Amino acid sequence: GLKTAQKTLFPLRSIDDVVRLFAAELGREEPDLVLLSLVLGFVEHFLAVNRVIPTNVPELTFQPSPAPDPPGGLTYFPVADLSIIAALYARFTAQIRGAVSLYPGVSSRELVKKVSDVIWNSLSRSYFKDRAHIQSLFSFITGTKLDSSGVAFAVVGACQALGLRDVHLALSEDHAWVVFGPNGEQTAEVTWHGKGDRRGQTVNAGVAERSWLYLKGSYMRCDRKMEVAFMVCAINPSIDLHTDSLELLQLQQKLLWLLYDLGHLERYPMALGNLADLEELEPTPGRPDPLTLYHKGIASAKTYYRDEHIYPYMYLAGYHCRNRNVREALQAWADTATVIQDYNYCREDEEIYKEFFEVANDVIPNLLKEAASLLGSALQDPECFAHLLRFYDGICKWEEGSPTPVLHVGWATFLVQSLGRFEGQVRQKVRITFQSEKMKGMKELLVATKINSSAIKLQLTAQS
């Protein structure tokens, strides 16, 4: 049953009606995660899954009369009636409350597994786990489909609906599970990970193996407010690969600012980075500019998570790169590799591997080609060259002694090209200490007047 204070806010006819519902729920000790996620999923379904009116803008013509069709296209909002949303809410709570007095303010491992099994066993047996728009309880209720972290959110939402206030969402930079118990020290896997589960297990073994997936234990223990922030970050504006709903972007943006003003992103580095990326494209007057927010996310990760997160520096580097700040982008990537070098590359870390691959083999090559077209230039600065080498040193040190290889011949092709962007007289100016055995073993090749492509390929692809 929905409280009477929640009912009065309906119907939701605009983004700001949604913002006030979130504003009202965040003021309470337990924001209703189920209600909020259903509303977002309903809105997302009718703005992105079943797009009622296309986003096409007609060809810019002019004439004395008005245009036959709205010349800039249309934005819209699907009205969210209380009857529709309350009915879906009642469906979910009727499901969970009926499915789980056996368990007498701490939750047992047995209880957490049962709630987790209720969600798990409701899911469709065959669907594509990486589709868009299957993150919300609206998707669970109306489609019985959830993506990987959506399972974990739904398990937490189910635990809240049974009054299990010690069960919270735990988040790494690519995985989700639950924490519970007297001091939040109990852990349980509740979903699968990767393109291929450990359900029921603790995360002790993943923390001990020092994989990026478990962040060496420096992962996010959410409270109820950070769980709202997660569902907001989980909004997917994509209508197709090349088209985002303006409405859903604007909704996510205003909701992130709402959480920001209430202080609920203080320990959420990726949320601050996501907000900065939104401000970069659609700046809000009177708000901090994106660089301020990127540095807030880095400071958050230093303050609360031992500076063991990767993405805060990737957010910053990408912004510098898109704004042609070559020195600052290369430095931020050198800082990114400086964090990863203390991790072991394990079999479930493909996501951060893919981001590093894109940086090394597409983003940096483009940044350097751009700088060469301009050509003081960054390609004439030995500090930029040294930042490039430190980036590769961190990657090599990451690989070194890891159970999974990192560098392959394709990486060496782009390294040789990037080295070539710096003239030999520039490269011969650096005097650097490397950490990785791989980079130590080719320091001389990196600063030689002629770049020996075949020798660098051999060295970069040497085993371990």
Ligand SMILES: CC1(CN2CCC3(CC2)CN(c2ncnnc2Oc2ccc(F)cc2C(=O)N2[C@@H]4CC[C@H]2COC4)C3)CC1
């Ligand atoms: C490389 C770049 C960009 N890149 C940075 C990395 C994110 C994509 C863009 C930012 N995302 C996150 N934002 C906020 N909270 N969690 C995020 O991540 C997860 C963490 C644990 C987990 F189990 C699943 C996800 C996950 O993937 N997500 C997305 C969105 C929220 C969450 C659930 O829905 C899908 C991932 C420059 C820094």
